[PDB]
């Protein structure tokens, strides 16, 4: 879980933000943002770790990473909201959509399939 | 060929689309003087878009702002504050006659 002091994806690139006030760096951090700003950084970390070209986000490899961050988001929402049937369906459908991506990626490029399963910790399983 | 033939062009005589009185303005829940202009002075009921003349997007901003100002301790509910009774009438509704 990226620390709360981590800067936002957008702001970090801007030059001259290294030497500014501590309060201006705290307003641009993850502490004063919502949960969707921390998920944009988690997706950024995986792409550098896994995909050769992070810039391309329309690839199958990128889509798996973008959808796996939502799965963790839903599991954190369902650990506190157990009776939320709406987000329990968005999770189970997302796990089925990722299984279809791992099948198509395992049939085309088995090299990246092993890389993604190792990076994300996905134990691929064949259907019954 | 001929040079008198008409040309493919968008209507130049077209008039600019009409706008509501509150187009381009921010509707805040603290401005009870503006939110009281769209409520009945006797019952406190919110007027519709056939009276106010507002658009769908601004009509729901007044409604959402009135309900929020009412429950926060900024605006009455059963009546219109008498202080804002001598303000410009913008709603199309005549009671007395």
């Amino acid at each position: 879980d990226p620390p709360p002091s981590t800067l936002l994806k957008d702001y970090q690139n801007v030059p001259g933000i290294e030497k500014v006030d501590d309060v201006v760096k705290r307003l641009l951090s993850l502490e004063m943002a919502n949960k969707k700003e921390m998920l944009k950084i988690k997706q950024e970390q995986f792409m550098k770790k896994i995909v050769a070209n992070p810039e391309d986000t329309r690839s199958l490899e990128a889509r798996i990473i973008a959808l796996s961050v939502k799965i963790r988001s839903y599991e954190e929402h369902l650990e506190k909201h157990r009776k939320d049937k709406a987000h329990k369906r968005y999770l189970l459908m997302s796990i089925d959509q990722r299984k279809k991506m791992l099948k198509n990626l395992r049939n085309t490029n088995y090299d990246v399939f092993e890389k993604i399963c190792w990076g994300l910790g996905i134990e691929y399983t064949f259907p019954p | 060929s001929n040079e008198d033939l008409p040309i493919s062009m968008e209507n130049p005589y077209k008039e600019p689309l009409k706008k509501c009185i509150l187009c381009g303005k921010h509707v805040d829940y603290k401005n009870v003087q503006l939110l009281s202009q769209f409520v009945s002075p006797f019952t406190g009921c919110i007027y519709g878009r056939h009276i106010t003349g507002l658009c769908g997007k601004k009509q729901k901003e007044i409604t959402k702002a009135i309900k929020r100002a009412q429950i926060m301790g900024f605006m009455p509910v059963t009546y219109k504050d008498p202080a804002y009774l001598k303000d410009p009438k913008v709603c199309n509704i005549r009671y007395r006659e």
């Binding site: - | 006797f42 019952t43 406190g44 009921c45 009546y79 509704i93 009671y95």
Partner: protein, 86 residues
């Protein structure tokens, strides 16, 4: 209960003409809808019945507006026949 009294739904009497004040007050309550609301709140109107009445009232308006819009559009043609005899 918690609001100020004698502001809401209050009309002052001019030269002891109570009749005009009561008619004005009743016109304020009918235009706002309070009169009809109080009549439907005496007996509980089930959701399904309340949705059937809103649709009936909305389709009646649509029809009445168009019929009126045509009557005002064709009232110009209610003049005397200019070609009497042909």
């Amino acid at each position: 209960a918690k609001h100020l009294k004698f502001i809401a739904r209050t009309v002052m009497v001019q030269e002891g003409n109570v009749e005009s004040a009561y008619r004005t007050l009743n016109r304020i309550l009918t235009m706002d809808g309070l009169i009809e609301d109080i009549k439907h709140r005496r007996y509980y109107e089930k959701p399904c019945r309340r949705r059937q009445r809103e649709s009936y009232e909305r389709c009646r308006r649509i029809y009445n507006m168009e019929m009126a819009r045509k009557i005002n559009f064709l009232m110009r043609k209610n003049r005397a026949d200019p070609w009497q005899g042909c």
